[PDB]
Amino acid sequence: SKPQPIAAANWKCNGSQQSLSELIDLFNSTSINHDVQCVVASTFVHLAMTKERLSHPKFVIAAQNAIAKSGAFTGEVSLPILKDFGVNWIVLGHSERRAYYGETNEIVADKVAAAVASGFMVIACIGETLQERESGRTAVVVLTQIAAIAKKLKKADWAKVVIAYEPVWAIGTGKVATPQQAQEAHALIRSWVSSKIGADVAGELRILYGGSVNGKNARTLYQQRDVNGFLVGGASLKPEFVDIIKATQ
Amino acid sequence: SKPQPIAAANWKCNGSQQSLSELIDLFNSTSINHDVQCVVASTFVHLAMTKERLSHPKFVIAAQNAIAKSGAFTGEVSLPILKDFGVNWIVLGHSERRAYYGETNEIVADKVAAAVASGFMVIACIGETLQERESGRTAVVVLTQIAAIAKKLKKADWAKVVIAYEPVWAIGTGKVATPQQAQEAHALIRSWVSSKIGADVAGELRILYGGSVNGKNARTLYQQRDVNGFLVGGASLKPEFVDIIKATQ
């Protein structure tokens, strides 16, 4: 007995005027039969165009990142800026940031909260690496991350949260995650929330899988018991996204 | 015998719809009597609005930052994206990035080049810190930075370059730079370019000062022999910017 699923497009560092024009036209002509929440998160440069073009009411826009405060922080963007722009969704702690940009469990927890404090909806990312997988550290690891976040939240805040789980271990390492594994992971986090925060809370919380999802392997993964959605990469620039959405019926 | 000066507004991590609306209206009603190049660099979020609103023809827009390539680099922005958005000016290696964001002489040199390669106009930032000042290291330091850049350029590329000098040592340290000092610094770099690259090149190159400039201390600093402009912070959100511009007659 599932909560409302989410299909979030993570466009990352891609796009053009024409191409994105193209996609969004696609989106807007697409008939979304069920209760899904579609999330599109582009570049700071493209948000406006996006804010302007998506008119499909089952879709929202989000940021791929931000920093908590305004100021003397050249070329960075802040929550307060985003809100004013009228953006109520954000993705924080994405593996790529953690890895190439110095995001520790600590900065993340600190941002999610602030974002949380400022009334945003948050897709907080977590996951473990290859070495972490192999030494058998997955639990010890993801729990730690989740904690770091949770330490900073009110229970009433959990409601603005969403946990997308990224299996960093199989992301570009030549290694492959199966649907079982994915499920095995989501069930972990859930037990945590549950045992630790409230099953009332655990029950309603959404958990997306952010490994590799395509138009093929999608249904199969939504069918998994603890899966409530997707955090998509490549496919999200493609039309297949429409297929991944339907995958969430 | 000076080249065309530049008055670049560095809005950093600030702004709102209304406030920025306000400023730009200011800008557009301002009569700019002389040959100045006015540069406005805002957030990625605000570029469009800015691209839309500034209509004053002696003004351009720029980015406060970017990364060389598109891809799997969440929440970052790239050259190729910017160009497509129609943005031909960028600021790279700003002290704040270097300090809080891991920008070494090496990344910078690598970006400026790429930016250079992609047809951008570049305000490359340099400067030394407090400890660097005190041990008497200013030359040894700025030269090193400039080099790092220069290593990567063609002589014909120097033409898309602009060197703004930031005296990191007096920026928020409670320490104060004088107009003499500023001049002393610009003359350093110039001798370098000159001795090292071509006086043809040295002659035409612009050097802005990015220390603290306000509506007061401005004229006095433009009067300095080796000063060709400004890289402004706070004042740039204020109307005083208009005064700093005039300061460049």
Side-chain angles (χ1 to χ4, degrees):
Chain A
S1 353
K2 284 192 181 184
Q4 168 191 38
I6 293 139
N10 186 1
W11 290 340
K12 313 216 173 113
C13 185
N14 296 290
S16 66
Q17 291 213 80
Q18 225 296 30
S19 86
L20 300 211
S21 281
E22 275 213 31
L23 221 16
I24 296 165
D25 279 350
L26 211 226
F27 292 168
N28 293 313
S29 290
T30 295
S31 128
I32 298 123
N33 4 52
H34 65 290
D35 185 40
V36 69
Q37 175 56 79
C38 341
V39 188
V40 190
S42 53
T43 71
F44 281 131
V45 199
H46 291 148
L47 303 174
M49 186 224 286
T50 308
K51 172 161 63 154
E52 297 159 321
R53 296 152 85 339
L54 268 170
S55 67
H56 190 311
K58 306 208 129 162
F59 281 79
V60 278
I61 87 300
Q64 326 191 347
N65 179 42
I67 98 234
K69 285 192 197 270
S70 287
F73 312 101
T74 296
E76 285 281 326
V77 175
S78 83
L79 303 180
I81 283 163
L82 313 162
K83 190 171 174 199
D84 173 84
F85 207 61
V87 173
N88 334 316
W89 281 71
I90 193 165
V91 191
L92 298 173
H94 174 291
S95 46
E96 280 142 8
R97 288 226 83 104
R98 294 209 189 233
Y100 339 118
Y101 311 105
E103 261 159 75
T104 76
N105 298 336
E106 275 79 23
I107 293 137
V108 175
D110 283 348
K111 325 185 147 169
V112 145
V116 168
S118 324
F120 277 81
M121 307 256 358
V122 182
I123 316 214
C125 301
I126 67 198
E128 86 279 22
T129 84
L130 204 11
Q131 331 72 259
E132 331 211 284
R133 184 131 270 245
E134 319 257 277
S135 19
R137 269 169 312 146
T138 326
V140 216
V141 152
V142 328
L143 297 229
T144 285
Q145 318 186 307
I146 215 259
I149 290 34
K151 280 206 229 112
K152 264 98 188 207
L153 296 198
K154 273 168 244 146
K155 171 222 227 160
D157 288 328
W158 275 78
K160 297 206 173 230
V161 192
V162 184
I163 305 331
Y165 165 70
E166 331 166 60
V168 195
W169 47 275
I171 275 160
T173 63
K175 228 81 186 165
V176 184
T178 75
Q180 268 56 65
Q181 326 205 251
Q183 158 68 18
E184 148 203 310
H186 286 232
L188 237 10
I189 313 205
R190 211 182 298 280
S191 321
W192 189 78
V193 173
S194 166
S195 99
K196 256 121 181 150
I197 315 240
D200 41 6
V201 175
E204 248 122 59
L205 167 104
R206 277 74 60 87
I207 312 170
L208 340 188
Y209 162 86
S212 329
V213 349
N214 59 67
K216 299 54 137 249
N217 80 337
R219 264 268 40 143
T220 326
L221 258 156
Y222 189 68
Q223 291 171 181
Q224 251 38 225
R225 171 213 310 161
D226 286 296
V227 184
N228 316 131
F230 306 115
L231 184 61
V232 205
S236 58
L237 298 164
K238 292 185 197 212
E240 274 185 80
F241 187 66
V242 157
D243 296 20
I244 297 137
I245 294 160
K246 279 125 120 242
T248 82
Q249 248 151 193
Chain B
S1 353
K2 284 192 181 184
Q4 168 191 38
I6 293 139
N10 186 1
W11 290 340
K12 313 216 173 113
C13 185
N14 296 290
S16 66
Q17 291 213 80
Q18 225 296 30
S19 86
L20 300 211
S21 281
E22 275 213 31
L23 221 16
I24 296 165
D25 279 350
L26 211 226
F27 292 168
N28 293 313
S29 290
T30 295
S31 128
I32 298 123
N33 4 52
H34 65 290
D35 185 40
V36 69
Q37 175 56 79
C38 341
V39 188
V40 190
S42 53
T43 71
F44 281 131
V45 199
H46 291 148
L47 303 174
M49 186 224 286
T50 308
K51 172 161 63 154
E52 297 159 321
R53 296 152 85 339
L54 268 170
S55 67
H56 190 311
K58 306 208 129 162
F59 281 79
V60 278
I61 87 300
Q64 326 191 347
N65 179 42
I67 98 234
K69 285 192 197 270
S70 287
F73 312 101
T74 296
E76 285 281 326
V77 175
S78 83
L79 303 180
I81 283 163
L82 313 162
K83 190 171 174 199
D84 173 84
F85 207 61
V87 173
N88 334 316
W89 281 71
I90 193 165
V91 191
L92 298 173
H94 174 291
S95 46
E96 280 142 8
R97 288 226 83 104
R98 294 209 189 233
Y100 339 118
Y101 311 105
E103 261 159 75
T104 76
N105 298 336
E106 275 79 23
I107 293 137
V108 175
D110 283 348
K111 325 185 147 169
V112 145
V116 168
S118 324
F120 277 81
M121 307 256 358
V122 182
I123 316 214
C125 301
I126 67 198
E128 86 279 22
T129 84
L130 204 11
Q131 331 72 259
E132 331 211 284
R133 184 131 270 245
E134 319 257 277
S135 19
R137 269 169 312 146
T138 326
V140 216
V141 152
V142 328
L143 297 229
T144 285
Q145 318 186 307
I146 215 259
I149 290 34
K151 280 206 229 112
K152 264 98 188 207
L153 296 198
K154 273 168 244 146
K155 171 222 227 160
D157 288 328
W158 275 78
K160 297 206 173 230
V161 192
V162 184
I163 305 331
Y165 165 70
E166 331 166 60
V168 195
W169 47 275
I171 275 160
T173 63
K175 228 81 186 165
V176 184
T178 75
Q180 268 56 65
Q181 326 205 251
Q183 158 68 18
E184 148 203 310
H186 286 232
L188 237 10
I189 313 205
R190 211 182 298 280
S191 321
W192 189 78
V193 173
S194 166
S195 99
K196 256 121 181 150
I197 315 240
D200 41 6
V201 175
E204 248 122 59
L205 167 104
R206 277 74 60 87
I207 312 170
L208 340 188
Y209 162 86
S212 329
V213 349
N214 59 67
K216 299 54 137 249
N217 80 337
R219 264 268 40 143
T220 326
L221 258 156
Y222 189 68
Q223 291 171 181
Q224 251 38 225
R225 171 213 310 161
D226 286 296
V227 184
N228 316 131
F230 306 115
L231 184 61
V232 205
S236 58
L237 298 164
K238 292 185 197 212
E240 274 185 80
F241 187 66
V242 157
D243 296 20
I244 297 137
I245 294 160
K246 279 125 120 242
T248 82
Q249 248 151 193

